[PDB]
Design a protein around this nucleic acid. Structure first.
Ligand SMILES: Nc1nc2c(ncn2[C@@H]2O[C@H](COP(=O)(O)OP(=O)(O)OP(=O)(O)O)[C@@H](O)[C@H]2O)c(=O)[nH]1
Ligand SMILES: [Mg+2]
Ligand SMILES: [Mg+2]
Lengths: 20, 296, 84, 368, 51, 108, 330
RNA sequence: UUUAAAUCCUUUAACGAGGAUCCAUUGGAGGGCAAGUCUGGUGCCAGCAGCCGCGGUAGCUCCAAUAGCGUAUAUU
RNA sequence: AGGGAAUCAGGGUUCGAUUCCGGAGAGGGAGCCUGAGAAACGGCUACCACAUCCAAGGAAGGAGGCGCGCAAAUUA
């Protein structure tokens, strides 16, 4: 019943360009 | 050269001082500070309330309900309210809260309710926030405990302004937190200063301590569904209030105030004196919905 | 039995919600759909639609007595000045 | 919760306060006990003036015209052109627009067609000279903040034209006007339309003959416009303004009789009468003119919840009633403290008006 | 940091897609776009200039 | 010349956004569109500041408080407009870069 | 006198002289005789003015009694007060729970009214789904919590506001809806459903309130489609856009174009079929091309305002509050 | 094991890797697009720019430094 | 007149180590008591200055943190 945070919230990467 | 460097350093210090000037509308005698306690549903919200109350008053309280008003120091009073996991109630308190105590489970980590309330605070005006994390007793005083403290702190500093204090609660002695940590926590609440929020300054508002029904009892037996006249008591906050005005009660609807009248202040501040500490006379608890001593 | 004051407003509110929900599941009118042809719309429908559009070129000027009198004034002035 | 009122007197201030507060008003029994029971034409033209400068309003008029129901909408600016009725002067409508100009959604650029100068209503020369600086005291100052008179008109022909433009402001700055000061200069404006230009000069030597002993510095302007600028009826008049050290302005004005009725007024008699009327104005002098008291009181109530003080002369019956409407609409009551000024030999006693403003801002302004 | 703003915006590389001919007019041929008509338009302009 | 520069010897300056002159005019240049008008707090001077990228105008509304820094180099990068000497860095003490990337939320 | 016949009278703000002075004798002239003349930065000055007003506000009504002070300035902050409210619903008192706080927020001028509210809106970065236009959504604005139907629109450079089907994924967007009047510059928050618990983030979107008005003025793009049937070099005959010769008369001179990008002009109606017309073009068309004309059609929003009454619920079900469902749920 | 007791350091049993997604960043410079919007002309063009299109809501390339890397003012 | 002064130890140039003091005071200037050693780091009286409790009669007393969106070692 516990709502743990997702991976996106934990590391607020946001709009960062994708690199190889 | 050095005076040029000293000149440039002072100007950068002045830049931080610059802000839009505004009339200072704070009351000469401010009302009690509203302190909200929230967190995940089983984090220990109600345990912290009792420890804070026992730190200041020595009065026994059982079955805590509604806001509780106590005197904490010579020049400051506090109103203590608990916020549940309900989304509707979480929104209302963010409008009225002056101080927010956020509870975090260190072993489990962050949860959804911690982040949702922070976003609500940013929408409706950001109050002063101090994060308190519990359940630190599970770790074994090792690299794991050291890194968990640092990891949770850095993620916390992005949500709030940098330097917002994060407080640690080590463990429970006999179902209560240690006396030293609670005393240090009470010192931080005492010494804060608060910025004026735009919405709270513009509109008068009241957090009602007591509710009373004022109708003719024969009307109720006639029709139980009749509209009822109800009287409420509270501390006036924000701005001035006129005799005839429109008020909105969230969760009920809009109403117009019929009559307004002031009363002598309960849980009032002491007349000034130079005793080192406040004696048992000055420490007062006003809790009309809670039950003080034994009577509820 | 007797009905409460609040329930009466709820009864009115539920009727309004019921009608609004029907509109969502109903097909959209031809005005709201983009790219509508002649067959879909009813005959002579656009005569009352009051749509907004643009014209390619300027319309031709209309001759009236006011233009005639103004133009005669220009000729009369030049005749007096002999500005041929 | 709508207010209820009876009668056609004080009609303008009831409509002006209703649109600012947002509360509907009902007016009943307009000229019930009269041969003509209906609403007058100039009052109806005022309602049409509100309709064009507002957005979303609703107006209900009885077929008899005895009762009126007015539901206020939001204030919307832009360019508006109106034809004022010739029965009442342009200044009759301009007082209401001065109350509503700074709170518009778009800056108001309005041109008014009608009669400019009249004996009944305050002249537009007076409003430009005195009322316009008063709004600058509240911070309504701006580059386009002007009144310009394109053409003059006199009754019954009228046919005059004025243009009015005012900036928009989010909030009103508080004021503390408690020192009137001493009068430095007297400036005056003389106008003659559809008559000999000599009438204006015969005004000048009469007013100057009286006022020269009090002050060395008096200069009277003379105004003569030709052609369609003059209007459709003849007449002449004089307006006088006195300027103080503190920046306050006190004014009085008179105009000649209309052609249709009344005996012709000797220009020498008109000059002395206006000069004496200005002298009585100084005997009651305060921070604001008696005409502009009700304008000043409204703007103090609309501040950002601050204490504001103004020193004004004896209260006219118009302002006394206007203070009563403010308590009904905005629930604000002033604190009144008269000043004896017994031995200072300034003149008649003055009244100090102080109050705390209600929280009020321009809801119409668009945030971008 | 003007380029830094540009790089973040171009993180998503999905480009707008083209629409095809409606089915009930399929036998007529392909719906020509600006890229196709430009081939036919420049062809005419070259011949008329030569004549 | 210790107080020669318009910032009064400081590296940055704080101002109130008066209006967006670029958006108010309807030219879709995107070099005109990124011009805002601010009034520095320290001395009250009115200057025109630049927003780094169109779409950061959305985060700024009227009467906000911004931090303005100089525009030392790369003035020729913007297309044919003089007076490119100032740029907006922070709004409400939050970086424009942080807001655009979705890394922070502006606090009211 | 102020605070303790006349009707049907002239409305003039002029003070008539009840008793004028002679102004010929010297004694009356004497009473009027005195009335005539015989390095800090801008930030420091602005602070200096504000501090002056700060003292004046506090030190004005101190002398008067508290009962007097209530009349002049109202009930000041910090005073314990008692309020009587009438016409409270019966369900409030019967189902009262002390844990749920009760808040009384004073309303400003005109805030009781309803109107058209324009907002700047951005979908929250952590919300999984997007918000569809013309579906119910709950807003938390000011003091209130209510559910309405919004219109999402995007601004153009010329100033036109065109309707959007959905909220953009990472851009700000305008929003318009019918609801209570709220002062500008305030923040607002949107949820989809208060009742029930969701594993994911529940905050839908966040923004600020921009404008208050009574007209939405929003438009939607509408294209009428036609197909050629006879081609004469530039000039081509078009059918399928219109269906009457009266109709074509309305739209003469309008600008039309093909999918290919050739711009054209409507010239004159044709009689041989019902609704065809003659249209010239920049260059020769093909049979496969499709012509269309771009027109803008104003839209409207239903006036639906449903305030939340979570306190008017039994003690057990204060969480479960329901209203209109969205299109997907239906 | 350490130590007054405990932590830390050193030994050491058992789990712990294929997109090994157990996913390095900061700054600079380029490419790609529709029945999309605006502005100006030299018919079919150019600039600016483009998560917004008719209906529909259930992760391109190159360069420099690398757990480090820029900007602003003064300056040498 | 924070600064010194010295001292020991040393193969890859010493990011070594430590000590030694000039006095005075205990809310302010005087008087007084003990002991081998103090005109006391501690009692008392008078005067001066503070502040606390009370049934209003009387009684008992002798140092640092913030002002940089920021106060836990002011501890165990
Ligand atoms: N071990 C440990 N347990 C804690 C701590 N803090 C709270 N708890 C647990 O929390 C329980 C108390 O529950 P509550 O006082 O009701 O806390 P709550 O979060 O308000 O729960 P609700 O009242 O249901 O909302 C105790 O039985 C503890 O087991 C802590 O710091 N350490
Ligand atoms: Mg609890
Ligand atoms: Mg392998």
């Amino acid at each position: 019943a516990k709502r743990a945070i997702t991976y996106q919230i934990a590391k607020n990467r946001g709009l960062t360009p994708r690199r190889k | 050269v050095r005076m040029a460097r000293s000149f440039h350093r002072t100007q950068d210090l002045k830049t931080k001082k610059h802000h839009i000037p505004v009339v200072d509308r704070t009351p000469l005698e401010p009302p009690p500070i509203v302190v909200v306690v929230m967190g995940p549903p089983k984090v220990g919200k109600s345990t912290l309330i009792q420890c804070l109350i026992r730190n200041f008053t020595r009065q026994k309280l059982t079955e805590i309900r509604g806001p509780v008003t106590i005197v904490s120091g010579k020049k400051r009073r506090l109103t203590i309210i608990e916020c549940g996991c309900d989304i509707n109630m979480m929104i209302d308190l963010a409008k009225v809260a002056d101080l927010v105590l956020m509870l975090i489970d260190a072993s489990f980590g962050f949860e959804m309710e911690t982040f949702e309330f922070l976003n609500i605070c940013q929408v409706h005006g950001f109050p002063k926030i101090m994060g308190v994390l519990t359940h630190l007793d599970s770790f074994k005083h090792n690299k794991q405990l050291k890194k968990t403290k640092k990891r949770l702190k850095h993620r916390f500093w992005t949500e709030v302004y940098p330097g917002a204090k994060l407080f640690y609660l080590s463990g429970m002695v006999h179902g209560e937190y240690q006396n030293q940590e609670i005393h240090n926590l009470g010192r931080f609440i005492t010494v804060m200063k608060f910025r004026p929020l735009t919405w709270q300054t513009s509109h008068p508002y009241i957090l009602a301590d007591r509710m009373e029904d004022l109708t003719n009892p024969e009307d109720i037996r006639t029709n139980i569904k009749c509209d009822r006249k109800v009287s409420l008591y509270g501390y006036l906050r924000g701005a001035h209030l006129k005799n005839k005005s429109q008020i909105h009660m969230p969760g009920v609807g809009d109403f117009a105030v019929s009559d307004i009248s002031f009363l002598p202040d309960p849980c009032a501040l002491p007349e000034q004196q130079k005793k080192r500490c406040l004696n048992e006379k000055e420490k007062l608890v006003y809790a009309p919905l809670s039950g003080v001593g034994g009577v509820l | 039995e007797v009905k409460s004051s609040f329930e009466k407003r709820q009864e009115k509110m539920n009727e309004k919600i019921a009608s609004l929900e029907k509109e969502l599941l109903e097909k959209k009118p031809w005005q709201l759909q983009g790219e509508v042809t002649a067959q879909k719309r009813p005959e002579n429908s656009l005569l009352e639609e009051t749509l907004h559009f643009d014209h390619a070129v300027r319309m031709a000027p209309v001759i009236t007595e006011e233009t005639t009198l103004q133009l005669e004034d220009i000729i009369k002035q030049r005749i007096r000045d002999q500005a041929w | 919760h709508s207010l209820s009122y009876a009668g056609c007197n004080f009609l303008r201030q009831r409509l002006v306060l209703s649109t600012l507060s947002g509360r509907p008003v009902k007016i009943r029994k307009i000229r019930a006990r009269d041969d003509n029971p209906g609403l007058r034409d100039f009052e109806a033209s005022f309602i049409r003036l509100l309709d064009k400068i507002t957005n979303g309003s609703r107006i209900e008029i009885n077929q008899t015209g005895t009762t009126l129901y007015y539901q206020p909408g939001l204030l919307y600016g832009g360019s508006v052109e109106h034809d004022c009725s010739v029965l009442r002067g342009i200044g009759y409508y301009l007082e209401s627009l001065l109350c509503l100009a700074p709170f518009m959604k778009h800056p108001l650029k309005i041109v008014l067609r009608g009669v400019t100068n009249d004996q009944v209503d305050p002249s537009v020369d007076v409003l430009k000279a005195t009322a316009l600086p008063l709004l600058k005291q509240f911070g309504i100052d701006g580059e386009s903040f002007e009144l310009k008179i394109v053409r003059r008109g006199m009754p019954p022909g009228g046919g005059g034209e004025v243009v009015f433009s005012c900036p928009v402001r989010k909030v009103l700055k508080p004021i503390q006007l408690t020192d009137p000061g001493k009068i430095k200069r007297i400036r005056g404006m003389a106008y003659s339309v559809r008559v000999s230009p000599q009438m204006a000069n015969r005004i000048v030597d009469s007013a100057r003959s009286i006022l020269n002993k009090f002050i060395p510095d008096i200069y009277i302007y003379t105004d003569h416009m030709k052609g369609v600028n003059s209007g459709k009826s003849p007449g002449f008049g004089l307006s006088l303004v006195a300027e103080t050290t503190s920046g306050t302005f006190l004014s009085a004005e008179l105009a000649s009789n209309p052609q249709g009725q009344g005996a012709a007024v000797l220009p020498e008699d008109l000059g002395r009468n206006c000069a004496r009327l200005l002298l009585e104005e100084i005997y009651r002098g305060g921070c604001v003119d008696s005409t502009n008291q009700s304008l000043a009181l409204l703007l103090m109530t609309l501040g950002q919840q601050d204490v504001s003080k103004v020193l004004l002369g004896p209260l006219s019956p118009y302002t006394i009633e206007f203070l009563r409407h403010l308590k009904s609409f905005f629930q604000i009551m002033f604190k009144i403290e008269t000043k004896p000024c017994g031995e200072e030999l300034k003149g008649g006693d003055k009244v100090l008006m102080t109050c705390v403003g209600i929280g009020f801002s321009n809801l119409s302004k668009t945030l971008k | 940091m003007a380029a830094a703003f540009r790089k973040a915006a171009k993180s998503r590389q999905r480009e707008h897609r083209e629409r095809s001919q409606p089915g009930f007019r399929k036998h007529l041929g392909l719906l020509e776009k600006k890229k196709d008509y430009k081939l036919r338009a420049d062809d005419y302009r070259k011949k008329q200039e030569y004549l | 010349a210790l107080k020669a520069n318009p910032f009064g010897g400081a590296s940055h300056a704080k101002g109130i956004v008066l209006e967006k002159v670029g958006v108010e005019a309807k030219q879709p240049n995107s070099a005109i569109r990124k011009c805002v008008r601010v009034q520095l707090i320290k001395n009250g001077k009115k200057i025109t500041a630049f927003v780094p990228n169109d779409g950061c105008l959305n985060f700024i509304e009227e009467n906000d408080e911004v931090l303005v820094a100089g525009f030392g180099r790369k003035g020729h990068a913007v297309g044919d407009i003089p007076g490119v000497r100032f740029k907006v860095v922070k709004v409400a003490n939050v970086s424009l870069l942080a807001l655009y990337k979705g890394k922070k939320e502006r606090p009211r | 006198l102020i605070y303790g016949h006349k009707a049907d009278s002239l409305d003039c703000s002029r003070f008539l002289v009840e008793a004028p002075h002679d102004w010929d004798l010297e004694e009356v002239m004497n009473s009027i005789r005195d009335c005539f003349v015989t390095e800090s930065t801008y930030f420091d000055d602005l602070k200096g003015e504000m501090q002056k007003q700060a003292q004046l506000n506090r030190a004005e009504f101190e002398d008067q009694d508290d009962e007097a002070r209530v009349q002049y300035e109202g009930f000041r902050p910090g005073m314990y007060v008692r309020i009587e409210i009438e016409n409270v619903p019966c369900e409030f008192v019967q189902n009262f729970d002390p844990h749920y706080p009760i808040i009384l927020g004073g309303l400003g001028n005109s805030e009781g009214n309803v109107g058209y509210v324009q907002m700047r809106l951005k979908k929250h970065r952590w919300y999984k789904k997007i918000l569809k236009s013309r579906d119910p959504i709950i807003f938390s604005v000011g003091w209130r919590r209510f559910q309405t139907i919004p219109l999402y629109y995007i601004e153009d450079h010329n100033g036109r506001q065109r309707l959007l089907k959905y909220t953009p994924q990472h851009m700000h967007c305008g929003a318009a809806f019918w609801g209570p009047i709220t002062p500008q510059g305030t923040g607002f928050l949107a949820i989809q459903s208060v009742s029930g618990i969701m594993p994911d983030f529940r905050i839908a979107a966040t923004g600020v309130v921009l404008d208050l008005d009574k007209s939405i003025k929003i438009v939607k793009k509408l294209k009428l489609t036609g197909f050629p049937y006879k081609i004469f070099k530039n000039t081509s005959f078009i059918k399928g856009m219109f269906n009457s010769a009266l109709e074509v008369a309305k739209f003469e001179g309008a600008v039309i174009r093909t999918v290919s990008g050739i711009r054209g002009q409507i010239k004159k109606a044709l009689r041989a079929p019902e609704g065809a017309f003659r249209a010239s073009f920049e260059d020769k068309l093909l049979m496969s091309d499709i012509v269309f004309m771009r027109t803008w059609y104003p839209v409207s929003i239903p006036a639906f305002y449903n305030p939340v009454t979570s306190l008017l619920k039994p003690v057990g079900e204060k969480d479960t509050w329901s209203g209109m469902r969205t299109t997907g749920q239906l």
